[PDB]
Design a protein around this ligand. Sequence first.
Ligand code: FAD
Length: 469
Amino acid sequence: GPRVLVVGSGIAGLGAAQKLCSHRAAPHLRVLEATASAGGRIRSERCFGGVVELGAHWIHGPSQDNPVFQLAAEFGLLGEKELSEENQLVPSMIWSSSGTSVSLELMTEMARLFYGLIERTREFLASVGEFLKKEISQQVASWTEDDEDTRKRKLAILNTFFNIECCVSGTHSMDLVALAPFGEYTVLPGLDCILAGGYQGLTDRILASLPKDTVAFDKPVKTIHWNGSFQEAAFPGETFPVLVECEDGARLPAHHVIVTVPLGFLKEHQDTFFEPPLPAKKAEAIKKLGFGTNNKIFLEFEEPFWEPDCQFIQVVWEDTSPLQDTALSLQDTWFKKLIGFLVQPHVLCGFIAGLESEFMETLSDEEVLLSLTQVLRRVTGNPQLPAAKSVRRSQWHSAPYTRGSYSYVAVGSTGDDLDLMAQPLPGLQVLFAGEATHRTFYSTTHGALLSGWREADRLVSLWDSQVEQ
Ligand SMILES: Cc1cc2nc3c(=O)[nH]c(=O)nc-3n(C[C@H](O)[C@H](O)[C@H](O)COP(=O)(O)OP(=O)(O)OC[C@H]3O[C@@H](n4cnc5c(N)ncnc54)[C@H](O)[C@@H]3O)c2cc1C
């Protein structure tokens, strides 16, 4: 059969390999993975006696049209609530940096203002951030009754919603997120849920369905040589259009290479990763699209200091405002970008996106644990709060084979750029899959899976056309 090489063993590469290998007239296929394990940005680990997810956490929109929801149900990875029709159809403590609780009514008021504005942006099919700020500023000019203290509290609360949105988009700033394309991203119905035993159970299940020795780990690709006529070392010295050159020196001829490497990797290395250089159209989509950093900081405590019914500890930074912030501006300290902490169902998980998140990665584990212990002592107004016992944090920007968390349609790029990312090279010598190749489900596990299946289907159609001719 034809020789296929899949670069990367995340859910896109695994989905492509599974669909191709399950074909009754299967090709000779190898998956080349840079790291020691499969799953890529789905990365579940044994930590603090439990399971922590360093990458993907939720099935976003766990309903009928979500293929990740469908697989997780087929595989027995979901609990009873997650499987329910009620769930498919669809608890915080808010702390100010002054060590006082924030009014629930005020929080609701600002959430309605902020998310109503988000809903408006999703209908314009410059930046999301600029639109929100212009509308918020207009509303501020109508806050006649409020004393300067109330207006200050309202802007501070709004700043945390902007930081939460930075986590959602995987951007440093909403001012970097293109306005017109924003609404193309599709939200499927359902109350987002976890896979209790680990999201990695999903990719381990797909991986195990592949023929033995399909995936080679610790086998990073250095350069894909395409548009050539390359002899294989053995008889009958057949010519192949592609030669995959591995970092370890391996010379692998192939008829088709499915590239599923992250956009951050392509941004750093597209100039050396492809020989000849990618066509300009594709090179420019790689450059123009966004690829931001979002990290998780897990903190273990000997005893919980939060209420047992508490699921998220939201932080509001006093005297902060989104109206002062610009696309490339930084917060006063890296930790002011942190939105708060999800209580693991005694573990907390802090979320932080952007340049402050990349800066966090440069700090030692010790600095992060100590700094966040002081932040927690500050925001809960408790100087005797015991320090966290342990820390485990993701470092997505630093990861040489990822270089960030996920794609977004940045100012300067459109949904057409996600289509350019998916466009194959001539003769289907090189195909592209991955979350940054899906126009409406980019930045998700389901987008990545669907893109893998799309490339498997494109190849099967070519092979079927060779038989007919
Ligand atoms: C912090 C974080 C939170 C997220 N939260 C969610 C969430 O809750 N829900 C959700 O649906 N999505 C979420 N996502 C997004 C989701 O994880 C991804 O969109 C999806 O997993 C990407 O799959 P992929 O196959 O496209 O890429 P990857 O999973 O990154 O797979 C690409 C593979 O390519 C390999 N590789 C790279 N370079 C080379 C090379 N030169 N040679 C060989 N192999 C190479 C990598 O090691 C990797 O295994 C999150 C991601 C992160 C990081």
